[PDB]
C-alpha cells in the first residue's frame, strides 16, 4: 500500500516521458494486482494512485468495478475514494453508472450527513438521462426537508435533474413553493437559481413564479441595506453571488410584462446608483443590472442611466471591463440602437486594440451596429480592418462584410463592387459556403451583368488559386457569357474579350493542380453551357471534353463522358436543355 505522497514524489522524480510512462506502468501493474486480490485494507492508496495516473494521462478502464465496490463500502475513507473515482472516471458514456443507481439509493437514506451529501454531489456531477428517472422520487423527498446544509444540495440535484430531464420539472413545482423566506444565503441562492432554471426551461411556471416578484424585490432591498456581514461580504460587497442571482432573476422575469418591470424599477434605480464599482464585484453587479434593465421593459430613465454607465465603463482601461462593456453593447444592439450610435468612435478604436477578445468584441459590435445609412461609411472601415486583420479574423471579417452587404446593401452596384473587392482581397479566407449565397445573389440580380462579367473576367485572368473567387468567376462566366462578349462570333476589333481567352482560362483551371474538384466541376459546367450561349468558339470544347472524359475522378469522368455524349450525339438537342435556371430567394 504505497502512499499517495510517495507516488507523487516518484512521478516528480521522472524526467523523460518514456521513463515516466514506464514508472506509471510499473505502478499500475501493482495496482491491478492488488485490485485482483480483492484488497480492502489499503485500497484507498491504490485508488489514489490510480486516480493520479488517470489524471496524469494513463488509462483507468480496469479500475471501474473497484470504484463501484468501494462506493457500496462502509468505510468513510473508502466511500470518499469511491465517490471521487465515480466523479472523475465515471460519466454517462461509461455505461457502468447504471449499477451506481442502487448504491446511490442505498446511500440516499443514510443517517450520516456526509455520505448522503457525497452521494447527492456525485449524482449531480454525473447525472444521466436514466439515473435521474429512477432517482427523481428520492430527490423530492430531500427537497422538502429543513436541513440548511442539505437544502442547497437538494436544489442543485433538482436543477441537474431538470437540465437532464426537462419533462420532470412538473414534479418540482409543489416542492419549491413558499421557499423565499430562507435566512441562509446559500439556501436562498439555491432557491433563486432553481426558480431561474424553471423559468428558463418552460414559460408555464412564469405566471406562477411571477407572483413572487415583490418578495424578491424586498429580499434584494434588504440585502442591499445589509451592506455589512462577516460571511459572504467580499471587497465591501455582501452576497455578490446572491446579488448576481437576484439580478439575473429580475432580468429574466417581466421582460415582456409591465407590472413585473414596474415592480423592480425602483430596486433597479436604487441599485444603479447605490453601488460601488471600485472592485470587480461592483463592476460585475453593475453589468448584471444593466443587462437585466436592457432585457426588461424598464423606464426611460433606467435606460439613460444604463447608457451612461456603459459609456463610463467603455473608457475603463481594464481589459475585463472593456470586454464586459462590449458584450453589453452587443447584447443591447437591437434594443436602444439609436443610443448605441454615440459610441461609434469607441467601437472603431476597439478594433485596433491589442486584445484578441477585445478586437473580436469590437468587430462584432461594429457588424451589429451597421444600419441602412452608415453602411456606406462603415464599408471603408470594414475593408481597412479586413486588410490589416488577424489571420483568424480575416475570414470572419469577410463573412460579416458579405452578410452586411446582403442585408443592408445601399445599392446593387455598390454591393457587387464590395463583394468583388472582398473576394479579391480575402483570397483563401472566404468560406466555401458563401459561394452558393454569392451565386444566388448574382442570379437574383438581372440588371448589372455586363460590368460584373467584365470585372470577373479581369479578376480571373490574374490569379486562379482562390477557390471561392475562381468558382464565383466560373459561375459568372457560365451564366453571362452572352453578355461578357458581344458580337464575338468571328474575328473583330481588339477588345477585352476575344472568345478564346475564356476557353483557355477554363482549360487551365481544369488542368491546373490548384483545384479541389469543386472549381473544376464549375469550370466544366461553364464550358458545357458555353456551347449554346457562345456560338463563335464552337467545335473546340468538344475535343477538350472528350479528352477530359478519361479523368481519374469518378464524378469528373462521368461529367466529361456525359458532355462528350451530348456533344457527339445530341448536338441539336444540346440547346434544348441549356436554358437559364430559375432565380429564387
Amino acid at each position: 500500500p504505497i502512499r499517495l505522497r510517495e507516488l507523487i514524489r516518484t512521478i516528480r522524480t521522472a524526467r523523460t516521458q518514456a521513463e515516466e510512462r514506464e514508472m506509471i506502468q510499473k505502478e499500475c501493474a501493482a495496482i491491478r494486482s492488488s485490485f485482483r486480490e480483492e484488497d480492502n485494507t489499503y485500497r484507498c492508496r491504490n485508488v489514489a494512485k490510480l486516480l493520479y495516473m488517470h489524471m496524469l494521462g494513463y488509462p483507468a478502464h480496469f479500475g471501474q468495478l473497484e470504484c463501484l465496490k468501494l462506493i457500496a463500502s462502509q468505510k468513510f475513507t473508502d466511500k470518499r475514494i469511491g465517490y471521487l473515482g465515480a466523479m472523475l472516471l465515471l460519466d454517462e458514456r461509461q455505461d457502468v453508472h447504471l449499477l451506481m443507481t442502487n448504491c446511490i439509493k442505498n446511500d440516499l437514506n443514510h443517517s450520516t450527513q456526509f455520505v448522503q451529501g457525497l452521494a447527492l454531489c456525485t449524482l449531480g456531477c454525473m447525472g444521466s438521462s436514466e439515473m435521474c428517472r429512477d432517482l427523481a422520487g428520492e430527490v423530492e423527498k430531500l427537497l422538502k426537508t429543513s436541513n440548511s446544509y442539505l437544502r442547497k444540495k437538494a436544489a442543485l440535484c433538482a436543477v441537474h435533474v431538470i437540465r437532464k430531464v426537462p419533462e420532470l420539472m412538473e414534479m418540482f413545482l409543489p416542492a419549491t413553493k413558499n421557499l423565499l423566506n430562507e435566512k441562509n444565503h446559500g439556501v436562498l441562492h439555491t432557491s433563486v437559481v432553481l426558480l431561474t432554471e424553471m423559468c428558463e426551461r418552460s414559460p408555464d411556471m412564469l405566471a406562477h413564479f411571477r407572483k413572487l416578484v415583490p418578495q424578491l424585490v424586498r429580499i434584494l432591498k434588504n440585502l442591499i441595506m445589509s451592506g455589512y456581514s462577516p460571511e459572504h461580504d467580499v471587497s465591501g460587497i455582501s452576497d455578490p453571488f446572491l446579488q448576481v442571482r437576484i439580478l439575473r432573476l429580475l432580468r429574466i422575469l417581466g421582460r415582456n410584462d409591465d407590472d413585473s418591470s414596474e415592480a423592480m424599477n425602483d430596486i433597479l434605480a436604487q441599485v444603479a446608483t447605490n453601488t460601488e464599482t471600485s472592485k470587480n464585484v461592483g463592476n460585475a453587479i453593475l453589468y448584471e443590472t444593466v443587462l437585466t434593465i436592457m432585457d426588461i421593459k424598464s423606464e426611460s430613465g433606467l435606460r439613460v442611466l444604463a447608457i451612461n454607465i456603459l459609456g463610463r465603463f467603455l473608457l475603463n482601461n481594464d481589459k475585463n471591463i472593456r470586454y464586459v462593456a462590449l458584450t453589453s453593447l452587443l447584447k443591447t444592439v437591437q434594443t436602444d440602437h439609436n443610443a448605441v450610435q454615440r459610441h461609434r468612435s469607441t467601437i472603431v478604436d476597439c478594433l485596433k486594440d491589442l486584445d484578441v477578445s477585445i478586437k473580436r468584441r469590437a468587430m462584432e459590435l461594429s457588424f451589429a451596429l451597421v444600419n441602412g445609412n452608415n453602411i456606406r461609411g462603415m464599408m471603408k472601415e470594414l475593408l481597412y480592418f479586413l486588410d490589416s486583420c488577424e489571420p483568424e479574423f480575416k475570414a470572419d471579417c469577410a463573412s460579416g462584410i458579405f452578410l452586411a452587404a446582403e442585408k443592408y446593401a445601399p445599392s446593387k452596384r455598390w454591393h457587387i463592387d464590395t463583394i468583388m473587392r472582398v473576394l479579391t482581397t480575402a483570397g483563401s479566407y472566404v468560406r466555401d459556403d458563401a459561394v452558393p449565397n454569392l451565386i444566388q445573389l448574382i442570379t437574383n440580380s438581372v440588371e448589372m451583368h455586363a460590368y460584373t462579367v467584365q470585372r470577373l473576367y479581369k479578376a480571373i485572368l490574374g490569379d486562379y488559386s482562390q477557390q471561392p473567387l475562381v468558382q464565383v468567376a466560373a459561375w459568372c462566366i457560365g451564366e453571362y457569357g452572352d453578355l461578357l462578349v458581344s458580337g464575338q462570333c468571328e474575328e473583330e476589333e481588339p477588345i477585352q474579350v476575344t472568345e478564346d481567352e475564356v476557353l483557355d482560362i477554363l482549360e487551365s483551371v481544369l488542368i491546373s493542380n490548384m483545384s479541389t474538384s469543386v472549381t473544376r466541376g464549375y469550370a466544366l459546367t461553364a464550358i458545357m453551357k458555353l456551347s449554346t450561349r457562345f456560338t463563335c468558339t464552337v467545335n473546340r470544347i468538344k475535343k477538350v471534353v472528350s479528352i477530359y472524359g478519361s479523368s481519374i475522378d469518378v464524378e469528373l469522368q462521368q461529367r466529361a463522358v456525359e458532355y462528350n455524349a451530348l456533344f457527339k450525339k445530341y448536338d441539336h438537342m444540346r440547346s434544348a436543355l441549356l436554358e437559364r435556371m430559375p432565380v429564387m430567394e
Binding site: 507523487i8 516528480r12 489514489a48 493520479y52 489524471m55 494521462g57 468513510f76 475513507t77 470518499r80 471521487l84 466523479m87 460519466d91 454517462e92 458514456r93 450520516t112 456526509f114 451529501g117 457525497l118 454531489c121 449531480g124 456531477c125 454525473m126 442547497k152 444540495k153 442543485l156 436543477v159 441537474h160 437540465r163 444565503h185 446559500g186 441562492h189 439555491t190 437559481v193 462577516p230 460571511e231 459572504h232 467580499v234 452576497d239 455578490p240 453571488f241 448576481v244 439575473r248 470587480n280 464585484v281 460585475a284 453589468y287 448584471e288 443587462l291 481594464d318 481589459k319 475585463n320 472593456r322 470586454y323 464586459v324 491589442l354 486584445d355 484578441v356 477578445s357 477585445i358 473580436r360
Partner: protein, 142 residues
C-alpha cells in the same frame, strides 16, 4: 453554470480538473490540450476572457499555476472571476499558505473542497466560513 474548471501550471502540467459536461475521454483530452495551448499562447493583457467554442473561457492565474473556467454565454463574466477568487481564498484558508507543492500532494482535499463548494457547474455556498466549517466537520469524521 461552469462547464469545466481546470487548474494547470505554467509549464502545461494540470494540477486540477473538473468538467461538468459529459464528453469523450479523447475529446476531453483534445479540448484540454487546446485550452492549454490557447492560454499558454496568450499575453498578460488579453482581458482574462476567451470565447473558445462559444464558451467564455476565463483565465485568471494568481501564481505560476493558472485557473480556467467554462461559462456559457448566459451570465456575467465578472461573477466567474469573483467565484474563482473566493475559491482560491477558501483553499488558502483551509490549507494555510497554499503553494504549488501542496496542490499535487493534497489534490484529494482540493477536489473535496471543490465538490462541497461548486456542484454541477453552479455554486453551493455563497459564504466562505460556512463552507470551511463544513469541510472541517467532514474531514474530522475519519
Amino acid at each position: 453554470m461552469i462547464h469545466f474548471i481546470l487548474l494547470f501550471s505554467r509549464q502545461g502540467k494540470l494540477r486540477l480538473q473538473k468538467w461538468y459536461i459529459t464528453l469523450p475521454d479523447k475529446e476531453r483530452k483534445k479540448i484540454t490540450r487546446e485550452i492549454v495551448q490557447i492560454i499558454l499562447s496568450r499575453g498578460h493583457r488579453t482581458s482574462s476572457f476567451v470565447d473558445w467554442k462559444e464558451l467564455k473561457l476565463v483565465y485568471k492565474r494568481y501564481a505560476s499555476l493558472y485557473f480556467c473556467c467554462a461559462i456559457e454565454n448566459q451570465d456575467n463574466e465578472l461573477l466567474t472571476l469573483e467565484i474563482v477568487h473566493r475559491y482560491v481564498e477558501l483553499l488558502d484558508k483551509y490549507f494555510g499558505n497554499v503553494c504549488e507543492l501542496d496542490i499535487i500532494f493534497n489534490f484529494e482535499k482540493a477536489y473535496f473542497i471543490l465538490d462541497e463548494f461548486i456542484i454541477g457547474g453552479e455554486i453551493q455556498e455563497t459564504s466562505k466560513k460556512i463552507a470551511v466549517k463544513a469541510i472541517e466537520d467532514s474531514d474530522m469524521l475519519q
